[PDB]
Design a protein around this ligand. Sequence first.
Ligand SMILES: [Pt+2]
Ligand SMILES: [Pt+2]
Ligand SMILES: [Pt+2]
Length: 121
Amino acid sequence: DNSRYTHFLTQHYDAKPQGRDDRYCESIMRRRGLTSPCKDINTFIHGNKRSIKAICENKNGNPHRENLRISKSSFQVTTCKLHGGSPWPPCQYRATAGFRNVVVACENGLPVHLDQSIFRR
Ligand SMILES: [Pt+2]
Ligand SMILES: [Pt+2]
Ligand SMILES: [Pt+2]
């Protein structure tokens, strides 16, 4: 059952996004099913999937707080933050592009949770 890994990728992985502007956030949040209700904040990791998986090994991760792992490498990310407002569509988002390491939870060698708290700021 790698369904939590597949859901992680749906909520938090976009290999090569192109523009990482407000329109990108509004479109991908709809595409990935995150607008019923409107998720308040959601981050997408970009780049190679093998790098994200490697976070669950000593190859690209350290243990972090109680039960998480933090990556040794930096990743291109885009944080989508709801503007307002309403919990139901239409959902308007502000994009913030960044480049830093990420905090995940691992199960059976695979990422299954992204810790959003480092992208609140
Ligand atoms: Pt979900
Ligand atoms: Pt706003
Ligand atoms: Pt406003």
